[PDB]
Amino acid sequence: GTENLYFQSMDPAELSTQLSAPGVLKVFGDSTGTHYKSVLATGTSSARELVKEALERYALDPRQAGQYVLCDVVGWQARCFRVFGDSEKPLLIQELWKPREGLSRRFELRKRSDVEELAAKEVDTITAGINAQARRLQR
Ligand SMILES: [Cl-]
Ligand SMILES: [Pb+2]
Ligand SMILES: [Pb+2]
């Protein structure tokens, strides 16, 4: 519905398999573990559908699916990540885009509220850093 992946100049056959071919996605947690649960997908599976499958498979309750989020995490120590929008197609993004040379990739299930608290956290590490720089200078 808010889909932002598009294929161009393609043929029905290569495009139908691209979207109908099955795949497994290894879905990790925050890093509560180094252990992953394999999640079944196709090129049509949305991030929201795949969050639901992931929670079901973690033995958590899919009712709270809407309060979790799938993340494309580059890192093994995590360094940066991107939150999938609900309508995105993670199986296809997996195929087509990859970590910069040196880094490696993990899809992680994560609670929204843990994501926003991580934004707040990085605003504070920037801001602290600026108030540190400032104090050094004026004294
Ligand atoms: Cl339950
Ligand atoms: Pb499309
Ligand atoms: Pb977890």
Side-chain angles (χ1 to χ4, degrees), residues 3-31 33-54:
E3 296 182 53
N4 73 350
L5 198 78
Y6 302 87
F7 287 106
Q8 186 154 312
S9 75
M10 217 157 188
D11 47 315
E14 271 216 5
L15 179 54
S16 178
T17 70
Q18 196 75 301
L19 281 40
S20 298
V24 273
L25 261 21
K26 298 185 188 161
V27 178
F28 298 72
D30 188 17
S31 169
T34 99
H35 299 50
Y36 64 86
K37 292 262 183 268
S38 295
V39 161
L40 282 218
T42 72
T44 302
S45 301
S46 66
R48 168 162 209 84
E49 291 167 342
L50 293 176
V51 172
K52 278 157 184 166
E53 175 161 20

Side-chain angles (χ1 to χ4, degrees), residues 59-63:
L60 287 148
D61 176 19
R63 291 203 216 83

